[PDB]
Design a protein around this ligand. Structure first.
Ligand SMILES: *[P@@](=O)(CCCC)OC[C@@H](COC(=O)NCCCC)OC(=O)NCCCC
Length: 196
C-alpha cells in the first residue's frame, strides 16, 4: 500500500537489519506514492517482512507542486523531516544498514537531506536510487558529499526534468518498470556488499 511507517512504529527491541527511507513525487498519495510500493515489495522478498523496515517521508513533507521552484528543489521543512527520519533510525537501531530513494521532488529531497546528514550517519546509507531526478543536470547526476558508486539515477530520454526543465512529459511517468526490477536490485546488491 501507499503508506508505510515501519520505523516510527517499530520496536527498538526488535530492529530490522535494513531500513529503507523513501520520498514520493509531487502530488503522490500516502507516503510512498506510485513507485515506493513496488520497491518495497521487492525488498521484502529479498530480506523478509522482518528483515527490512519500509518508511515513507510523511510529516512536514507535503509534496507541493510549488516547492519544486525553491532553491533546493523542495522545502526546508521537508528536508528537516527526512533528516529526522535518518537520525531516528540511527538512534533506535544503531546496527541497521540504511538505503534510500526518491522520485521527482522526492529525489531532490533525498539528495538535499543526504547532503546535510552527519557523515557518521551518512556512511550508513549503503545505496540511494533516484527517479526523474529534478536536479540531475544541475548536480551533474550526483548527490553532494555522497559516493557515486552508492548512487543510481533513472532518467528517461525525453524526461525534461532530468535535462534542467520542470515540464512533465510522457517519459517522466514511465519509471514503473525500473522501480520493479533494476532499482531494487541495485539496493539489494549494495546492502549485501556493505554487510561483509
Ligand atoms: P515531480 O515531483 C516534479 C513536478 C514538476 C513540477 O513530479 C512527479 C509527477 C507524478 O506524476 C503523476 O503521478 N501523474 C499522475 C497522472 C495524472 C493524470 O508529478 C506531476 O506531474 N504532478 C501533477 C499532478 C497531476 C496533474
Amino acid at each position: 500500500r501507499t503508506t508505510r511507517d515501519d520505523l516510527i512504529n517499530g520496536n527498538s527491541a526488535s530492529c530490522a537489519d535494513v531500513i529503507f527511507i523513501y520520498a514520493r513525487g509531487s502530488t503522490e498519495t500516502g507516503n510512498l506514492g506510485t513507485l515506493g510500493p513496488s520497491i518495497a515489495s521487492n525488498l521484502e522478498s529479498a530480506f523478509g517482512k522482518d528483515g527490512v523496515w519500509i518508511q515513507g517521508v510523511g510529516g512536514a513533507y507535503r509534496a507541493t507542486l510549488g516547492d519544486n521552484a525553491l532553491p533546493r528543489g523542495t522545502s526546508s521543512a521537508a528536508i528537516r523531516e527526512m533528516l529526522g527520519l535518518f537520525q531516528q533510525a540511527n538512534t533506535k537501531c544503531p546496527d541497521a544498514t540504511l538505503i534510500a530513494g526518491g522520485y521527482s521532488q522526492g529525489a531532490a529531497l533525498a539528495a538535499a537531506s543526504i547532503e546535510d546528514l552527519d557523515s557518521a550517519i551518512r556512511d550508513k546509507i549503503a545505496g540511494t536510487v533516484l527517479f526523474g531526478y529534478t536536479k540531475n543536470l544541475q548536480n551533474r547526476g550526483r548527490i553532494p558529499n555522497y559516493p557515486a558508486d552508492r548512487t543510481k539515477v533513472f532518467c528517461n530520454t525525453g524526461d525534461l526534468v532530468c535535462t534542467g526543465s520542470l515540464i512533465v512529459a510522457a517519459p517522466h511517468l514511465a519509471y514503473g518498470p525500473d522501480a520493479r526490477g533494476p532499482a531494487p536490485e541495485f539496493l539489494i546488491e549494495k546492502v549485501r556488499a556493505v554487510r561483509g
